[PDB]
Every structure is written in C-alpha cells, then in structure tokens.
C-alpha cells in the first residue's frame, strides 16, 4: 500500500 520511493526520497 506504500511505495519504497516515499522513504528513498524523504527519510532523513
């Protein structure tokens, strides 16, 4: 339900 790209681009 959640793409890995969310974390790849924003998780500090």
């Amino acid at each position, epitope marked *: 339900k959640r*793409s890995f*790209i969310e974390d790849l681009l924003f*998780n*500090k």
Partner: antibody
Amino acid sequence: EVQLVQSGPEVKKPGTSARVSCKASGFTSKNTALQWVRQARGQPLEWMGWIDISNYITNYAQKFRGRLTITWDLSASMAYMELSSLRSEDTAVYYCAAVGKDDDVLTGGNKYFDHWGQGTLVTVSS
Amino acid sequence: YELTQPPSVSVSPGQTARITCSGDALPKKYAYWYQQKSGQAPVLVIHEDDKRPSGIPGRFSASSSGTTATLTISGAQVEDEADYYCYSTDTNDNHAFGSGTKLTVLS
C-alpha cells in the same frame, strides 16, 4: 535521453472529467515515480499525486482523493491523470514529472533525477 | 501538510539571498528546492536538504535545521530572479510544495 511529452491544451465543461497524458521515455530505473502537479494562474505549485511505475502504487493528495486517478501504461510508456467532476477552480496548468534515483554505475553511487513535462493547460468553462 | 515561505524576498546584485521554508516534519523529511521562471516548468536547484544538482551553479546552497529549511543564493545574479518553492512531505506521506517566494534581484 529521457523525455516527457504531455498532451495539448483542452477546454472542458464543468462536471466533466479531464484526461491528461504524459509520454515518459527512457525511464528504466526501478525507483521511478511519475507525479502530477498543477498550478493556477499566479498560484503556487500544488502536488496532486504520483504513481510508482514499477509496482503501480499510487499516492493521492487528500484534496483530490475521490476525484483523481493516476495510471501508468507500461506497454505505451504513457502516464495519465484523470480528474473528474471538474469545477472552475480546476483551471490550471497540469504538469507531469519523473522523480527517483538512478544507480550511477559511473561513480558507483546513486543519483537523484528530476524531469518535468511542458505542462498542459486545462480550462474549465461552460 | 503546509510549508510556509515568505511571499517575496529582495536582494541586491552580488549579495546573499536567503529563503526560508517552515514545516513541522522537516526534522524527519528531506526538503527539495525548485526554481520557476515565467512560462516555464519548475527546475530543481536543491535536493535532499543540501545536495546541489550537477547543472546548478555553486552559489546555490541550502540547509535544514529544526522546522526551517533555508535556501541560500550567494552573490545573487540577475538570472536568479524567479519564484522559489520548497517541497517535502510529512510523517503520513502527505507531499506538499511551499507557498512560494518571489525573489527579486534589485535592478
């Protein structure tokens, strides 16, 4: 090289649905998302949503949930946004954009990439 | 999710411009910066808080501390006159662009 080419401008009547296409060529990295961003005249950029084109997982902004669909047609290398129940305030330039990271085999690291279509003016008027 | 920017910033040619971007999730989420000129699509000038894209001049830099991300343009030039938008997300994956800042390079 990568390319993003959007469909031409369209006038739509209130209550109808607008479909905007974005041909995305050359994007083979697994971590690629195609996003849609709109901008009314003199207004800020507004992120509408995106789709992870490797697994088709979508993320729609809260304001557009129930009205917005973002699709990826792998066979045609075509991304689409569909915005239904159009209102006057939906008049804006709609942009597609490809974002993500590449495995940079040259340096051995990763490279963030960021590419934008030319924009599509959707005019909502009866 | 809301990211707050000053509506307008003025800078003398050759001086330093600073554009702030306030968001509650910036301690956990990266900020991106985009430059937009009239009739053009936005152009990335900073990604991941402080990383400078390959084609962006060295006078562009940025940082993030607390709930404030700051874009710094040293030695501002006439070509740097544009609208600037920060961009990030919150802890519930709500993406947002900032309210935007019109940077005038005083002529």
